[PDB]
Amino acid sequence: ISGGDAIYSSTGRCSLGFNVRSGSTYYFLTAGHCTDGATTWWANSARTTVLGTTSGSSFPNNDYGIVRYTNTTIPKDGTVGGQDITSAANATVGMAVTRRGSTTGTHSGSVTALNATVNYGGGDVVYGMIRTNVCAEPGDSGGPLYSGTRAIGLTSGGSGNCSSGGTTFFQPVTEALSAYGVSVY
């Protein structure tokens, strides 16, 4: 399984962000709004292939979560679909980026602004977000935003869709990496 693939919790479906590790312990990052109140994660809608269990969740304010792999045999590729990821970097205005999600697949665009505040309502406000002109649709949450072989962010949300176009905000992946002491590979 790799970045962009579907992941299922007891509640719904999100996308795997990036496979990461600390020492010999493997995890995957995804959106905090997906890990919030989720315990177990599966690789399929049938819930027959277990992935692991939630180890951390940060939402709102931030939008990242981490799941510890408990499935010993499933391949944990350090890629986004076929794309190798070799490091993480900070987004910059004008940067060409690409997102992969379980609903819409792969779409590209540019970073249009940094440190944006997104209000999802009900007191669910997230800060320090990357703004882009990349579209995203339900199911794409937590999917990776990358640029070449560099990991940039995790899909959080926004408006519009892929047909009409839209604005999607991403959580900087560097912040999640630091919080959990993990790294891409």
Partner: protein
Amino acid sequence: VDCSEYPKPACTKEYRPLCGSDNKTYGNKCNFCNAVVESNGTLTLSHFGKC
């Protein structure tokens, strides 16, 4: 599902589908409620889950 607190300028992108009266499957409650507002209240919930 109550859409009174809509519209909302942004929606998270998790998938937990709802079926609208227009036979369109809406990806999540936020997308659905924004569509209801956009329809000026004409769209309604048909049932939970995919259409």
